[PDB]
Structure 1
Amino acid sequence: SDEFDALRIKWATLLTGGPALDPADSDIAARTDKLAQDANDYWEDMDLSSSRTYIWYALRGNGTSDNVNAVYERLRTMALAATTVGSSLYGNADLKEDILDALDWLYVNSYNSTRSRSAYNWWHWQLGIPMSLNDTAVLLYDDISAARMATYMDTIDYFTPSIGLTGANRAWQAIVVGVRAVIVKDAVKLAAARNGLSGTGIFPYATGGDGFYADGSFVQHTTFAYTGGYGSSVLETTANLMYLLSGSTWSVSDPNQSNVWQWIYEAYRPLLYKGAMMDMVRGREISRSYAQDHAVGHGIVASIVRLAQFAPAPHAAAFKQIAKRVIQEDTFSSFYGDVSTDTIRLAKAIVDDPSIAPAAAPNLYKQYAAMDRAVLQRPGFALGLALYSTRISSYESINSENGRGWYTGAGATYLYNQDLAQYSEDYWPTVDAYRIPGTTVASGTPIASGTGTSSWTGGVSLAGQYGASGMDLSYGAYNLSARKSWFMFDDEIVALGSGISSTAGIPIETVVDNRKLNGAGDNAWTANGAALSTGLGVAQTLTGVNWVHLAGNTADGSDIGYYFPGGATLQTKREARTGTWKQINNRPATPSTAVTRNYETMWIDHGTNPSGASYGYVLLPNKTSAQVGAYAADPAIEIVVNTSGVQSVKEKTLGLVGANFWTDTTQTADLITSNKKASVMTREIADERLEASVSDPTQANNGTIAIELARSAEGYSADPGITVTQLAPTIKFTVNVNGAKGKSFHASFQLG
């Protein structure tokens, strides 16, 4: 033997689940049957003709990278069906033979050094195809000749001989070279793969461009929030590669590898809700039918389990606890149902281990300043907030994917409750893309893909417990500007809008919500205590409503209440919508099968060419119509100010006051006074203590923010960067936000 052989086998069991696999296992069996089925389902449809012009009729075209790549995965699947224990084709030599015949057939007929490393979608040629090829090599290593195994590895080394790209792509190169390095037994290349992990976009935090940030954000393609998309890939490949090298003379040494641990705690954990990976951080992938939020979540949790296999003691146990809690929480789609068999074996061992307790659920407010996102996690629900600015683009759409993502990150609110399927079950191809909840837009008209013109997008976090966010809106595709804010407290979220003006000559609207209902569309809902009709295809105007209650798709834990402080007039419609995935993802491999889902859509009509229009509403998750009614009578909320210059809301019961100052002029909101653009939040414990948090959301102030609180103090403690200059009669201090990059500064004052 030798290490190279031991590694190859470790990678084989990572793909197979090794000899240990227990087919008797209910979930392992299911995965196995499905494999064997799909596999031969192909095999018994291949063109085994000695003189074939293609291998699969539906995948003909040795020149279309998309099809070629697809035939390699096809093979890959057959290679696994012939290797995974419990498979209906385990051992079948003829299967193996056919696989190899097909391989060389493509060496001369398509994939070889005859092509350029530039051909459209170099990705397929340099990464995609060689990733499947390596795995086949590894699985069929034995059944392969010396020369045959050369036409394979030589061509791969051609397309991708070195590592030197960005994040996701760099990691793919790394595992592409690493894996082929162990099978070709080459220490130089293999050591190059280990070192690639230290490159930009991976281990080291990035202060610009692609990669992971210290605040836990993840960027790809320079301006897109992508933790759930490309981020997801970087996590998987890195975990897989680090696991292989782990324990060998090529093990990862770089001290930065520790950052990988934080990715889990800060970058992913807060963005997972009972199995789902929030769509707002998945980029254009939301348009992929095979990658909806829960499927994606499973892939991530799968990587957590992988990590737990070699991570240091403190972290590994933590990884097991988290994986266990997620696997148990997801009652929508079984985790074991869409992950590798080896992953099933490993997770099963964590879940049934009575010594491993599920980790507590996250309860917090996190401001991902570097990617314009924000999250609130509470016991019964979670809120995802997607914004954009001069730093982050509205949405991404390339290769004919996500053609309707216009408003996906333009002040969009995503509510997660017991209805775990809300954003799954073909939501994306059926939801009216022009009415994304939380947004303000010109009716039925889109916006362009790109970064905005305003720097003011971000928010403040009060000790990761509460927070407030804001977005200075100004579309480029058409005239419309507005000031939008959100204040997250304990059980409610207040959304405020002001300065809504436009000359576009198109009716402007703010969509309060657009929820997918049950299969019947009969969800009960009330307004001001009156039961409303539940029929499909009906559109009604609710005038002068103070509160609305919509019942969830689950018996408990998914109802949603809406309160309108000054009362309002809502435009609503409950309809059945039909659409296909091909409409938002025009690729050959995407399903054209039409699907129908039901929706209850509600919006505020601002009229045509409005000037200085405003709006205010509060989301009350998981409350009964009676609780919503009670709230609407004696509310815990009190709007302090909702102007073009400052938006502020107070939570009477918690003693919280949040405020977003939109201009560089002196303004005061309740007890708060600011001289510069800022996001501020305070908590007051009568005659005892006053807390304050401040941030410069613009990330452009290279001076300070002068704050003054209307209270008398006798002592204080503050984060560095804060200088207190007066404690009495009133509190005064400045915040050095030079290069703060959107972070929040905290200070606590003692009263008496």
Structure 2
Amino acid sequence: SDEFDALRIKWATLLTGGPALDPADSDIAARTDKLAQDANDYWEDMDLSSSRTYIWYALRGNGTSDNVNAVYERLRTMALAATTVGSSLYGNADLKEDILDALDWLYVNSYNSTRSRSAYNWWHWQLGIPMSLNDIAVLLYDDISAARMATYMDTIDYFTPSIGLTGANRAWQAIVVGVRAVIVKDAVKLAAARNGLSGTGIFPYATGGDGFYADGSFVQHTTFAYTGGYGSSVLETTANLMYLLSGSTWSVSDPNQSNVWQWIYEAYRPLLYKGAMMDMVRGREISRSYAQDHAVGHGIVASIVRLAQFAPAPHAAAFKQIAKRVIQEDTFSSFYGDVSTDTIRLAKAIVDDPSIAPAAAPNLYKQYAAMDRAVLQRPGFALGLALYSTRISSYESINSENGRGWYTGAGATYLYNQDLAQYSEDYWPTVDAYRIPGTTVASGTPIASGTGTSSWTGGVSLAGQYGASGMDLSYGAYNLSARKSWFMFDDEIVALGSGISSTAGIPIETVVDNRKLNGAGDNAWTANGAALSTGLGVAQTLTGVNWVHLAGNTADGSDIGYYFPGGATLQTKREARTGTWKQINNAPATPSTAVTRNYETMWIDHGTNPSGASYGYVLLPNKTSAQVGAYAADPAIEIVVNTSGVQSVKEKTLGLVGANFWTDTTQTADLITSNKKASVMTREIADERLEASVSDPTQANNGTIAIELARSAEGYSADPGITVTQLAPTIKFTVNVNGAKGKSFHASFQLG
């Protein structure tokens, strides 16, 4: 036995759970049960005749990369069923041989070096297939002759001999070259796989393009927020590869590997809510039925569990605590139900260890300036905000996926509460894609996939506790512009809209919300203290509305209140919507089954061709009908301004004042004066201190932002980049935002 052999066995256990798998474990047993079932099902449908022209009639098409890739995945599952302790097919020599015969047939008639490396779809030929093939080779290594292995490994080397791509693609390349290097025992290729992780979009922080950013963002495909899609893939692969190499001659030594720990704390943690990975960072993947938010979240936790196996202190311990929290938090879907057999073994060990306490839940406001995203995490809820700009695209739709993703990143608000299933259970193929919560659009009209012409997108963070975001709207597909802002407080999210103008000749609307209701669609709801009808198929306008309360799908923790300063007229409808995943993901393997879900949808009609139209509402998570009325009796927020020049909100109780300045002209909002485009938030503690945070959301000001605060200070301290020129009678300072990339600068002033 050599070191390569030890690595192959290490990878093998990562795929099978190892020889120590406990058949007595309820979840493990079920996993090995399905595995054998799915294996027998496929094995049962195989054409074993030597005169065969396909392995599975359903997947015939030696040239259709999609079908071929699916054939190898099936063979991988069958190989797993024949090598996982506890499986009723474990050690089945007849199965093992039928798998190897299929591989030889695929080699001769489909996957070999006679094909173009860049033939559609390149991803299948260079990555997808090789990843499945390497696993089969490791699992059935001992039953593979030198002649057979050559045809398998030579082919993979032809398609992917090296690593030179970015992010997930680069990591995928690394794992392909790496596992093969272990199989054929090539120290040079294995060294190269390890080095691949030090490249673009992986360990080193990116300041542009694909990769992880210092502020926690992750981008893939140049301009798309992807922490939860391609981001999940890069984490999974990076984690698996690092674990494999750890402690060996090729163990990762690059010092930047410590960045991986930060990805967990800053890139993934803030975007997870009780097991769900927010859809706003999953790109076109929201259109995949097998990857709804909780299933993706489980995958993220699986990687964290993987890292906990080799990461150094105190990260390994923190990782275990995070995983334990999320596993206990997710009462929607069992974590063990959709992760590898080995993950189950490793996870249970963490959950069953009493010395490991679940980590605390995140509580903060975070601005992901690099990917036009923002998030608020609090006890009982989380709010995700998705924007786009000249830097980040509206939405991605390629390979026939996410066809209706139009407004998923156009000032879209996502509220997470005790109704963990809100965005799962076929939300995406049924929700009205033209009415994404929080957005302003031309009724029933789509927009194009691409970056916008406006740079003002982003926001400010006040010591990571509170914050405000804004997006300068101006669609390219049709005429519509507006200033949209969001102010995040403790349990109030205020949305303001101004300067809403259009010459499109299409009715303009702003979606207050659009929530999936219970199976009967009879969720109780109230307006101004009066109960509203709960029947499905009913449309109704609510005029002079001061507030609305909508009971959630859970007895407690999922109610939502809506307050309208100055009153409003709401257009609403409660209906059952049918659809299929095939409609938003035209892939043949996509389930065509029809599904029906119920929704309560509310929006404000701005009319056709508005000019300077506006809106203002307050989202009130987890308040009962009585509490919403109470709030309306003495609202805690006050709109300071809502013009096209400045939008500001004040929260008296907390002493908070947020203000988004849209032009490069001197303007004032309450105590705040700014000479340029900026996002600002101050917190005042009567006669004690005045805190202030400022950012240049445009990421294009190469000079400064001149701020003045209407208070007299005694002293101060400030982040470098801020220069104070006056404390009394008023506060004056400039913020050097040159190359700041949307970050927030903080200062604290001592008051007299």
Give the alignment's TM-score, normalised by structure 1. 1.00
Deviations 1:9-49 (A, max 9, x none): 00000000000001111000111111100011000110001
Measured after TM superposition, the shift of residue 436 of structure 1 is: 0.2
Question: Shift of the alpha carbon at 1:414?
Answer: 0.1
Distance, in Å, in 1 between the alignment partners of 2:197 and 2:50 is 44
Which residue number corresponds to residue 118 of structure 1? 118
Q: Alpha-carbon deviation of 1:88?
A: 1.3
Deviation at 1:68, TM superposition (A): 0.5
Cα deviation for residue 690 of structure 1 reads: 0.5
Secondary structure in 1 aligned to 2:650? strand
Deviation at 1:206, TM superposition (A): 0.3
- Aligned counterpart, 1:694: 694
Residue in structure 2 matched with residue 426 of structure 1 by the alignment: 426
Once the two structures are superposed, residues 375-403 of structure 1 have per-residue CA deviations (whole angstroms, 9 ceiling, x without a partner) of 00000100000000000000000000000
Deviation at 1:116, TM superposition (A): 1.1
SS in 2 for 1:370: helix
| Structure 2 Cα separation of the partners of residues 143 and 714 of structure 1 | 79
Partner SS, residue 615 of structure 2: strand
2:525 is equivalent to residue 511 of structure 1: no
Q: Partners of 1:714 and 1:339 in 2: how far apart?
A: 57
Residue matched to 1:493 = 493
Cα offset, 1:531, TM superposition? 0.4
Question: Using the alignment, how far apart are the partners of 1:486 and 1:404 within structure 2?
Answer: 25
CA distance in 1 between counterparts of 2:152 and 2:191 reads 21
Q: Deviations over 1:101-149 (max 9, x none)?
A: 1010111111111111011111100111010000000000001101111
Secondary structure of 2:711 counterpart: coil
Distance 1:369 1:313 in 2: 30
In the aligned structure 1, how far is the partner of 2:568 from the partner of 2:446? 26
Distance 2:313 2:658 in 1: 41
| C-alpha RMSD over aligned residues | 0.4
Deviation at 1:293, TM superposition (A): 0.2
Q: Distance in 2 between matches of 1:145 and 1:104?
A: 12
**Whole-angstrom CA distance in 2 between matches of 1:504 and 1:327:** 49
TM-superposed deviation, 1:57: 0.3
Match of 1:186 in 2: 186
- The superposition leaves residues 489-525 of structure 1 with CA deviations (integer Å, 9 ceiling, x where unpaired) of 0110000000000000000000000000000000000
Unmatched 5+ stretches in structure 2: none
How big is each residue's C-alpha offset from its partner over 1:316-369, in whole Å with a ceiling of 9 and x where there is no partner?
000000000000000000000000010000000000100000000000000000
After TM superposition, give the deviation of residue 567 of structure 1 in Å: 0.2
SS of the equivalent of 2:654 reads: coil
Query: Following TM superposition, by how much is the alpha carbon of 1:439 offset from its aligned partner in structure 2, in angstroms?
Result: 0.3
Cα distance in 2 for residues equivalent to 1:55 and 1:165: 32
Return the alpha-carbon distance in structure 1 between the equivalents of residues 316 and 81 of structure 2: 31
CA separation in 2, counterparts of 1:484 and 1:474? 11
TM-score for the superposition, normalised by structure 2: 1.00
User: The residue matched to 1:85 in structure 2 has which SS?
Assistant: coil
Taking the aligned partners of 2:409 and 2:662, their CA distance within structure 1 comes to: 20
| 2:505 is aligned with 1:502 | no
**Equivalence for 1:40:** 40
Show CA shifts across 1:532-561 (max 9, x none): 000000000000000000000000000000
Instruction: Give the whole-Å Cα distance in 1 for the aligned partners of 2:296 and 2:491.
Output: 28
> How far apart, CA to CA, are the structure 2 residues paired with 1:159 and 1:375?
41
Q: Tell me how far apart the structure 1 counterparts of residues 107 and 614 of structure 2 sit (CA, whole Å).
A: 64
Tell whether 2:628 aligns with 1:628. yes
> What per-residue deviation string (whole Å, max 9, x for no partner) do you get for residues 148-186 of structure 1?
110110111000001111111000000000000011011
Please give the per-residue CA displacement for 1:676-723, whole angstroms capped at 9, x wherever unaligned: 000000000011100000000000000000000000011000000000
Task: Tell me, in whole angstroms, the C-alpha distance in 2 between the residues paired with 1:144 and 1:673.
Answer: 74
1:421-455 CA distances to partner (integer Å, 9 max, x unpaired)? 00000000000000000000000000000000100
Distance 2:663 2:554 in 1: 44
Alignment pair present for 1:742 and 2:708: no
CA separation in 2, counterparts of 1:148 and 1:655? 72
Structure 1 residue matching 2:494: 3-state secondary structure: strand
TM-fit CA distance, 1:569: 0.3
Q: Report the Cα distance in structure 2 between the residues aligned to 1:39 and 1:301, rounded to whole angstroms.
A: 26
Shift of the alpha carbon at 1:474?
A: 0.2
Alignment deviations for residues 230-288 of structure 1 (CA, whole Å, 9 cap, x no partner): 00000000000000000001000000000000000000000000000000000000000
Q: CA deviation at 1:633?
A: 1.1
Distance 1:33 1:204 in 2: 42
Distance 1:23 1:592 in 2: 36
Aligned counterparts of 1:659 and 1:157: Cα–Cα separation in 2: 56
Residue 98 of structure 1: how far off its partner (Å) = 0.3
**1:577 Cα shift?**
0.1
2-structure distance, mates of 1:182, 1:679: 52
Give me the whole-angstrom Cα distance separating, in 2, the residues matched to 1:387 and 1:461.
16
CA apart distance, 1:200? 0.4
Secondary structure class of the residue paired with 2:290: coil
Q: CA deviation at 1:751?
A: 0.7
Deviations 1:649-679, CA, capped at 9 Å, x for gaps: 0001000000000000000000000000000
Deviation, structure 1 residue 487: 0.1
Structure 1 residue 313 displacement after superposition: 1.4
Could you report, residue by residue, the CA deviation over 1:592-620 in whole angstroms, capped at 9, with x for unpaired residues? 00000000000000001000000000000
Taking the aligned partners of 2:50 and 2:156, their CA distance within structure 1 comes to: 26
Task: Give the whole-Å Cα distance in 2 for the aligned partners of 1:229 and 1:2.
Answer: 37
- Structure 1: how far apart are the matches of 2:673 and 2:241? 52
1:290 is paired with a residue whose SS is: helix
CA distance in 1, matches of 2:534, 2:443: 25
Cα distance in 2 for partners of 1:737, 1:267 equals 23
Measure how far apart 1:50 and its partner are: 1.3
SS in 2 for 1:147: helix
Q: Distance in 1 between matches of 2:475 and 2:313?
A: 50
In the alignment, the residues of structure 1 paired with residue 624 and residue 115 of structure 2 have an alpha-carbon distance, to the nearest angstrom, of 64
